[PDB]
């Protein structure tokens, strides 16, 4: 039977979101001048002359 008072329900969710899909559209990276480009040790790659 459709017992009305026993079949209602309180659905609890949030008020507002702002769903962002892609995240690396926010940072804006740069590069130092490639003659001052540093390897894993702190001398520079292509150092020699």
């Amino acid at each position: 039977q459709f017992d009305f008072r026993a079949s209602m329900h309180m659905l609890t969710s949030n008020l507002t979101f702002t769903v962002y899909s892609d995240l690396l559209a926010f940072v804006s990276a740069d590069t130092v001048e490639p003659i001052n480009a540093v390897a894993f040790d702190n001398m520079r790659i292509m150092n020699e002359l």
Binding site: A25, S28, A29, D30
Partner: protein, 72 residues
Amino acid sequence: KKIQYGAVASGEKQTKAANSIANLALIKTVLSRISNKYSFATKIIRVDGDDNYAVLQFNTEVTKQMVQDVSN
């Protein structure tokens, strides 16, 4: 009919060696004034008389609004 014309004379010896100076030295100035709004780093400025291009390398990825606001 004698018409006064003080502008450049297409037909000198100078007309290509000084259309590559006057157009590089012009676009080196108009690329300086658009750097009050977008900060970039230009890479080449090739100039051939009037016909010239100048590659601009940015910080972010180029979007549909940085193309419109540089062309404006």
